[PDB]
Design goal:
It is classed as ligase. Keywords: Rossmann fold, tRNA synthetase, ligase. It forms a monomeric assembly. With 839 residues, the protein is of the alpha+beta class. It has a domain at 623-801: Isoleucyl-tRNA Synthetase, Domain 1 (Orthogonal Bundle), CATH 1.10.730.10. It is built from 24 helices and 36 strands. The strands form ten sheets. Strands 10, 11, 12, 13, 14, 15 and 18 form a seven-stranded mixed sheet that branches. Strands 28, 29, 30, 31, 32 and 33 form a six-stranded mixed sheet that branches. Strands 2-1-26-27 form a four-stranded parallel sheet, with helices on one face. α20 (729-744) packs antiparallel against α21 and α21 (751-767) packs antiparallel against α22. The protein is globular, with a radius of gyration of 34 Å. The two termini are 66 Å apart. The structure holds ligand OVZ, magnesium ion and zinc ion.
């Protein structure tokens, strides 16, 4: 055994030992309990970053833990290859996105193999290969003829300079981020997944996810946004019907989730595209400018509540069908045309948004809800104004005294009696638009024929291969400029036809890749029936919190779609979910700001550039990114200390949910502990060699060795509970360090002492194997000759936890240090089990 810990010597040999044994290459063996541990597969951006290393180390710790407990563990890896990154690097390097993608895949695959992740590389997938996306094109065609996928016109943001479509997140003050030109709003036909049909199922099945973070389930419920409200129709006053036609001349229909406060409505608001706004603005220039300003907006839901709400009166009036109050209609900028009826009512006394809106324009506030003896200040909002559970109605006529639910049915009864309204259920969830005007993506299997219409590609002709011999210039979608691609024949009549040049949303490939891992070479479907029946669903899922809404909701949606097609048998894809925190680092620059990467900086007084001696400016600590040039390359971390030191540093610096801060001193400490672990096993084997680990009746051991066995098996139970239940790996590392400290302070020189020392070391290297498997595999082969994965997870000897009982009999006046203070708690004693009290 080498005296000093050398990572570059043991890590390749340990990885070769694991590959030759094929411990990670698992199949559908029905003679062993399966476990599907999955980490979110990465974009082949070029090289790994610290966020990747943390995620896949967390997944490998859990996978190796289940592996040591006898599970048939599958930990697959893959590449989310489609997207704008490859298209942007194409425009900057004059290289095809496919060639740029495949080079990154082979390089990042080399890095992942260097870290020693126990993954099944025989199940590797790449979403940009036709062997993969042929099946999402297949599901598209099946759902297209079923109506789940449909095609209709949708409004997009067009940049007339960059010649591309931009999202609302890419529109600043109505202009593009790169071009800076005023964006144009055009209606173009696009494809949609009718996800609203599964809205109630996607909402209620969240309750099954008992091992999901409650904030993630809460984030999905709010995004779905189911509300059980009331449709209310306000009769248009006879003096306000000019310019209106049809039902819009009869009434103004709104939707509200608080019909118990209908008596408190002081005004109503419509959208800019509402016919009431159109008729009222026909002769008012100030309203036409307000309607044009609303239509030219681009407020995303990530900041639609931070939008400055504003409105303008119209002069038209409607009638409240429950008290006769003549209410004026306003044009508001928060009423969205397409949500409900494009019109709402406002109760400023019990809705915080209507409160601020009314206080802005000095609009009346009518209290109709009272919660106890709480005072009502009309010039100050209080949280009890919007209470529903503990409130009764006031100033509501014959509705006073009722709570929320009874007044809900009471208002519904009156509205349905006169035909002025009825209950209704709605959802904030919109349909999923999947059309993208880019090249580097999965083609949409639709052929356009002027005789047959929008026709899906037959199953025999799939896939519609995306040509990889393309270098996008940027003046539009390259597929739209390639007649060799889109010109084809119609699959129904055989005449001249054009292919769909748009590609699919890249979230589609990540919505089902967890099923493809079960049979990534199955040529007859998305997933074979025998594999999906065996592996079932994903037991453990690890990924960042940024995907807690869209990606997870899309995966649950696709799971139910595939289930209803007889492909899979599960209702949910992910049983357990672990969201990892971000990785932050300090930033440095040199003004002239010119941010410098920390790997080239040398420092507690100040810091300076490693290339010379020019002092740098230390700035704030932020998440690692290319914005402030504070990303620390993980490859340099491996080249300096080895893979085990990197894994150990990330699992010990912070719990997985908590954000990890980069620290050069912390990396040195992790490497220093690995030296200590190596030195400990070496010094033990030098003074005698390996022996048989202690086992059996511990009675007869010294008090010192009994305490070391107590600390040992309590540490095993602590680590086992930290891996299985809490999933808090930094505390498990601390527990093993505490065991080694007591080992250092224990005389293990005797024959029975060596046996306990062997039991301590054989357990410590196995408890730390899921975290640092390279050095643990090497140290285990020096202490024991058997296979580590065949020895299994260390068992807890509960006999070593039961402490010795101090039993004796007390005696006061004849009849019935350490033992005297306990007896006096309830005069010389006998050194044994007898204490006499001379009173
Ligand atoms: C399931 C599927 C939807 C996943 C998808 N392929 C994906 O997110 N892949 S991934 O490679 O980003 O991360 C893959 C994994 O790594 C750990 C974590 C990173 C958190 C910090 N971070 C770093 C970064 C910069 N990279 C982002 C980037 C890169 C290139 C272009 C644009 C954006 N962002 N957040 C993740 O949540 C994810 O668990
Ligand atoms: Mg259950
Ligand atoms: Zn045709």
């Amino acid at each position: 055994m080498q005296e000093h810990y050398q990572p570059a010597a043991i890590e390749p040999a340990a990885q070769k030992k694991w590959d030759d044994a094929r411990i990670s290459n698992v199949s559908e063996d029905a003679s062993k309990p399966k476990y599907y541990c999955l980490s979110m597969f990465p974009y082949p951006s070029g090289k790994l970053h610290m966020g990747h290393v943390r995620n896949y180390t967390i997944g490998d710790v859990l996978s190796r833990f289940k592996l040591l407990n006898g599970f048939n563990v599958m930990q697959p890896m893959g590449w989310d290859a489609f997207g704008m990154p490859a298209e942007n690097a194409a425009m900057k390097n004059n290289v095809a996105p496919a060639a740029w993608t495949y080079d990154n895949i082979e390089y990042m695959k080399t890095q992942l193999k260097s870290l020693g992740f126990a993954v099944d590389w025989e199940r590797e997938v790449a979403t940009c290969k036709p062997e993969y996306y042929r099946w999402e094109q297949w599901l598209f065609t099946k759902l297209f003829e079923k109506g789940i996928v449909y095609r209709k016109n949708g409004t997009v943001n067009w940049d007339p300079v960059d010649q591309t479509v931009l999202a609302n997140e890419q529109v600043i003050d109505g202009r593009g981020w790169r071009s800076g030109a005023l964006i144009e709003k055009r209606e173009i036909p696009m494809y949609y997944f009718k996800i609203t049909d599964y809205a109630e199922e996607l909402l209620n099945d969240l309750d099954k996810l008992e091992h999901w973070p409650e904030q993630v389930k809460t984030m999905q419920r709010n995004w779905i946004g189911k509300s059980r409200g009331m449709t209310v129709r306000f009769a248009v006053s006879d003096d306000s019907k000019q310019g209106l036609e049809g039902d819009y001349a009869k009434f103004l229909q709104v939707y509200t989730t608080r019909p118990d406060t209908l008596m408190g409505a002081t005004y109503v608001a419509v959208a800019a595209e509402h016919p009431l706004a159109t008729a009222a603005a026909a002769d008012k220039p100030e309203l036409q400018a307000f309607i044009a300003e609303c239509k030219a907006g681009s407020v995303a839901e990530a900041d639609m509540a931070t939008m400055e709400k504003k409105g303008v009166p119209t002069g038209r009036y409607v009638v409240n069908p429950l008290n006769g109050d003549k209410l004026e209609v306003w044009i508001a900028n928060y009423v969205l045309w397409g949500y409900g009826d494009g019109a709402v009512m406002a109760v400023p006394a019990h809705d915080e948004r209507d409160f601020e809106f009314a206080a802005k324009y000095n609009l009346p506030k009518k209290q109709v809800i009272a919660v106890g003896d709480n005072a009502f200040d009309a010039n100050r909002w209080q949280e009890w104004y919007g209470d529903k559970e503990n409130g009764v109605l006031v100033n509501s006529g014959d509705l006073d005294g009722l709570d929320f639910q009874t007044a809900f049915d009471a208002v519904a009864a009156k509205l349905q009696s006169q035909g002025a309204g009825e209950p209704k259920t709605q959802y904030r969830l919109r349909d999923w638009g999947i059309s993208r005007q880019r090249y580097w993506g999965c083609p949409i299997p639709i052929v356009h024929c002027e005789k047959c219409g929008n026709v899906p590609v037959p199953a025999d002709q799939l896939p519609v291969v995306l040509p990889e011999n393309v270098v996008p210039d940027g003046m539009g979608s390259p597929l739209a400029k390639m007649p060799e691609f889109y010109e084809t024949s119609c699959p129904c009549c055989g005449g001249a036809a054009k292919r769909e040049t748009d590609t699919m949303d890249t979230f589609i490939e990540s919505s089902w890749y967890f099923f493809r891992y079960m049979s990534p070479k199955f040529s007859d479907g998305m997933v074979s029936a025998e594999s999906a029946k065996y592996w079932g669903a994903v037991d453990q899922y690890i990924g960042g919190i940024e995907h807690a809404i869209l990606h997870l909701l899309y995966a649950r949606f696709f799971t139910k779609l595939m289930r209803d097609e007889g492909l899979v048998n599960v209702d949910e894809p992910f049983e357990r979910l672990l969201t990892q925190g971000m990785v932050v680092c300090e930033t440095y620059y040199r003004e002239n700001k010119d941010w410098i990467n920390p790997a080239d900086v040398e420092l507690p007084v100040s810091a300076v550039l490693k290339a010379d001696g020019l002092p740098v400016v230390i700035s704030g600590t932020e998440k690692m990114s290319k914005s402030k040039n504070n990303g620390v390359d993980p490859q340099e971390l491996i080249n300096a200390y080895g893979a085990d030191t990197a894994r150990l540093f990330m699992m010990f610096a912070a719990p997985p949910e908590q954000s990890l801060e980069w620290s050069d001193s912390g990396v040195e400490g992790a490497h220093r502990f690995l030296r200590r672990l190596w030195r400990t096993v070496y010094e033990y084997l030098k003074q005698g060699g390996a022996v048989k680990a202690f086992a059996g009746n511990q009675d007869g051991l010294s008090k010192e060795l009994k305490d070391l066995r107590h600390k040992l098996h309590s540490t095993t139970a602590k680590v086992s509970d930290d891996y299985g239940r809490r999933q808090q790996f930094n505390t498990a590392i601390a527990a093993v360090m505490e065991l080694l400290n007591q080992y250092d302070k224990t005389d293990t020189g005797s024959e029975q002492g060596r046996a306990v020392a062997q039991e301590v070391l054989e357990a410590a290297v196995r408890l730390l194997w899921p975290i640092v498997p390279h050095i643990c595999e090497t140290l285990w082969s020096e202490l024991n000759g058997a296979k580590l994965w065949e020895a299994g997870w260390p068992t807890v000897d509960e006999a070593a936890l039961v402490k010795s009982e101090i039993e004796v009999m007390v005696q006061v006046n004849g009849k019935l240090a350490d033992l005297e203070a306990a007896a006096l708690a309830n005069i010389i004693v006998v050194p044994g089990r007898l204490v006499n009290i001379v009173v």
